[PDB]
Amino acid sequence: ITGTSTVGVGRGVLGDQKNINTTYSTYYYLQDNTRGNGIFTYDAKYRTTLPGSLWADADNQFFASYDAPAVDAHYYAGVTYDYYKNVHNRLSYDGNNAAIRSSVHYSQGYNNAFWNGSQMVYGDGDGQTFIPLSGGIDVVAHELTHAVTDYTAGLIYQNESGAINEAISDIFGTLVEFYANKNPDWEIGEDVYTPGISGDSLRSMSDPAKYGDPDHYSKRYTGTQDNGGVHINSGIINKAAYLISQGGTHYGVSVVGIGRDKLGKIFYRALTQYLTPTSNFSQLRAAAVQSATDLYGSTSQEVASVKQAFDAVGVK
Ligand SMILES: N[C@@H](Cc1c[nH]c2ccccc12)C(=O)O
Ligand SMILES: [Ca+2]
Ligand SMILES: [Ca+2]
Ligand SMILES: [Ca+2]
Ligand SMILES: [Ca+2]
Numbered sequence: 001i002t003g004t005s006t007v008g009v010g011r012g013v014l015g016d017q018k019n020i021n022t023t024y025s026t027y028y029y030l031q032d033n034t035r036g037n038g039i040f041t042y043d044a045k046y047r048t049t050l051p052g053s054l055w056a057d058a059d060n061q062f063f064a065s066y067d068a069p070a071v072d073a074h075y076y077a078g079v080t081y082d083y084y085k086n087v088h089n090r091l092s093y094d095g096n097n098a099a100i101r102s103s104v105h106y107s108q109g110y111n112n113a114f115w116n117g118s119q120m121v122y123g124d125g126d127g128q129t130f131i132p133l134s135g136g137i138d139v140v141a142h143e144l145t146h147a148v149t150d151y152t153a154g155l156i157y158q159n160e161s162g163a164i165n166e167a168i169s170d171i172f173g174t175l176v177e178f179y180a181n182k183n184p185d186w187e188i189g190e191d192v193y194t195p196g197i198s199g200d201s202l203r204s205m206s207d208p209a210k211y212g213d214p215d216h217y218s219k220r221y222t223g224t225q226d227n228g229g230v231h232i233n234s235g236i237i238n239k240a241a242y243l244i245s246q247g248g249t250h251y252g253v254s255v256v257g258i259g260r261d262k263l264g265k266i267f268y269r270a271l272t273q274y275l276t277p278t279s280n281f282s283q284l285r286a287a288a289v290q291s292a293t294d295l296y297g298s299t300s301q302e303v304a305s306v307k308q309a310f311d312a313v314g315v316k
């Protein structure tokens with residue numbers, strides 16, 4: 001909409017108060033004019049028609065239960081935008097300040113979220129498996145990272161290419177969570193998953209086998225479900241990214257950690273410079289090794305640690 005930039009206030013899915021950039025024209029809309037070509041949050045009104053209607057509010061206060069998912073989708077899209085801008089000098093997902101659009105209250109009891117090619121979409125969960133999914137900063141960043149991937153490597157969503165695509169979203173979703181610095185960890189979706197169970201999540205990057213996911217190439221899923229195990233074999237890459245950052249000894253192979261910022265730099269460079277739509281794990285190893293070489297030098301600890309991490313997960 002055309003209007004005046006304003007700042008509203010509400011509460012997110014987890015009861016936390018936060019300010020949100022809005023636009024005033026008769027109503028206050030969830031439209032942040034401060035970030036690129038804007039951040040727009042919509043209400044899917046429990047239907048599956050997208051995007052739905054640009055979120056409108058009479059008084060610029062967003063403290064209703066129904067408001068909560070919108071507040072977070074809007075806010076966390078903005079934090080994710082800041083991350084890519086401040087950390088990687090990337091302007092929105094296309095690198096050209098593309099408008100970022102999100103819809104909440106997608107369908108009824110919908111236990112997922114997604115990038116649809118055009119926008120992020122969030123279910124409300126069924127209240128047992130999930131609460132509204134935009135409540136997880138790593139979930140939001142995960143979904144918006146799919147758009148980054150679409151515009152860069154274009155990793156195809158199947159098999160090894162797709163498991164890399166998934167891992168990239170888990171990796172940057174996690175790095176955004178650390179950037180925002182609110183209860184950061186190496187698990188995925190812990191903030192919105194299973195409101196009746198403490199300390200679980202959908203996936204773990206530090207120990208993927210915790211939730212049934214492979215942590216070594218020998219344990220890769222080779223079947224056809226989940227597009228050839230894209231959310232399953234991502235555990236192999238997530239584990240490598242975790243080791244690169246934090247270090248550790250995994251199946252007897254030792255990795256010296258180089259930290260989250262270097263992990264991000266190396267994987268961001270691999271993603272934007274070397275990965276292609278059909279890149280496999282082995283080609284990802286080469287991309288990451290070359291990326292660390294470009295950044296730190298062929299004889300650097302950083303290159304050695306990337307090599308150790310891929311060795312540790314059996315990716316040569
Ligand atoms: N996003 C993952 C994991 C996931 C989230 N919600 C789910 C509900 C059912 C099965 C898997 C999931 C997927 O789509 O596979
Ligand atoms: Ca209101
Ligand atoms: Ca967390
Ligand atoms: Ca997390
Ligand atoms: Ca839980």
Ligand SMILES: [Zn+2]
Pocket residue numbers: 142143146166169
């Ligand atoms: Zn994903």
